[PDB]
């Protein structure tokens, strides 16, 4: 349901991948993670990585944004040429830093937490959190001046 040429999705996906050439960096990462010949497909394998998280990540990365030259451009794109054998963590971190996400083991699948504007899921007051001996239900900290 994804046409890479127009970068436009049709509707509900329901899985069922398709062999097409795309610049979508999310599915480049998906290929890196679950390819048996050269990637990490022997270890790991499918059903261990959240495909729907990558689906939403790709949809986000395919949005149109100002080009800066008066035109438009997709938000985030591939065109890397990996030549030197780095550790799998290095390449995974590079991919997850190019699009602002972070890989976390959900508990059943390896999800990705993309930095997106999301909605509040729950609300916590001092009557819903553990009180330690000192009266600090919520401890706060700040980033440093030079950071």
């Amino acid at each position: 349901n994804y046409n890479p040429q127009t970068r436009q999705y049709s509707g509900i996906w329901d899985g069922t991948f398709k062999p097409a050439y795309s610049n979508n960096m999310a599915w480049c990462l998906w290929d890196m993670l679950t390819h048996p010949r050269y990637g990490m497909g022997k270890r790991l394998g499918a059903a261990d990585v959240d495909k729907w998280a990558l689906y939403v990540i790709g949809q986000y990365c395919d949005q149109s944004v100002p080009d800066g030259f008066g035109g438009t451009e997709p938000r985030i794109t591939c065109n890397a040429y990996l030549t030197t054998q780095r550790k799998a963590w290095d390449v995974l971190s590079d991919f997850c830093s190019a699009m602002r996400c972070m890989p976390v083991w959900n508990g059943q699948t390896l999800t990705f937490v993309q930095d997106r504007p999301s909605d509040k899921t729950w609300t916590y007051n001092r009557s819903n959190v553990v009180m330690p001996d000192d009266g600090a239900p919520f401890r706060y900290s700040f980033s440093a001046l030079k950071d």
Binding site: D115, D119, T121, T123, Y124, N125, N128, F138, R139
Partner: protein, 148 residues
């Protein structure tokens, strides 16, 4: 490239603080990267949350611990949990002695000692996204989060 650099700079300049607020048994609902609002009465100068002591469906009213003060302008909202664990929201009509509130509609199944929150028209939500959730082999979950 400019967008990547600008995202880094904007995140560093805007997102500043983090919170640790280890919670009770409900922490099993949280996956890292979940946005949550924190209503801390110490951070604010007022009280904006608590538990529901008693519910009177007829002449619909709620009994709340602490004292709640309505704002001069606009309207406030009160968030209650219904009988299906769904966080419904109602509009506050009149609070008599800061313990007895009268709202537009009492949701069904609102039980006693359930969590109620207040939303004033001139208060920021103060959302935080979770980064780490630790089970404490006790039943409590240690949650770390950063501004959103």
């Amino acid at each position: 490239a400019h967008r990547a650099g600008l995202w880094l700079i904007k995140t560093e300049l805007l997102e500043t603080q983090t919170v640790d607020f280890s919670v009770g048994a409900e922490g099993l609902r949280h996956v890292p990267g979940d946005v949550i609002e924190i209503c801390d009465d110490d951070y604010a100068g007022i009280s904006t949350g608590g538990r529901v002591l008693a519910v009177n469906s007829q002449t619909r009213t709620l009994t709340l611990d602490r004292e709640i003060t309505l704002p001069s302008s606009g309207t406030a909202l009160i968030s209650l949990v219904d009988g299906s664990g769904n966080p419904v929201s109602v509009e506050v009509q009149s609070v008599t002695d800061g313990v007895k509130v009268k709202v537009s509609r009492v949701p069904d199944g609102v039980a006693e000692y359930s969590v109620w929150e207040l939303k004033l028209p001139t208060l920021r939500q103060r959302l935080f996204r979770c980064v780490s959730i630790r089970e404490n082999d006790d039943g409590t979950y240690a949650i770390t989060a950063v501004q959103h």
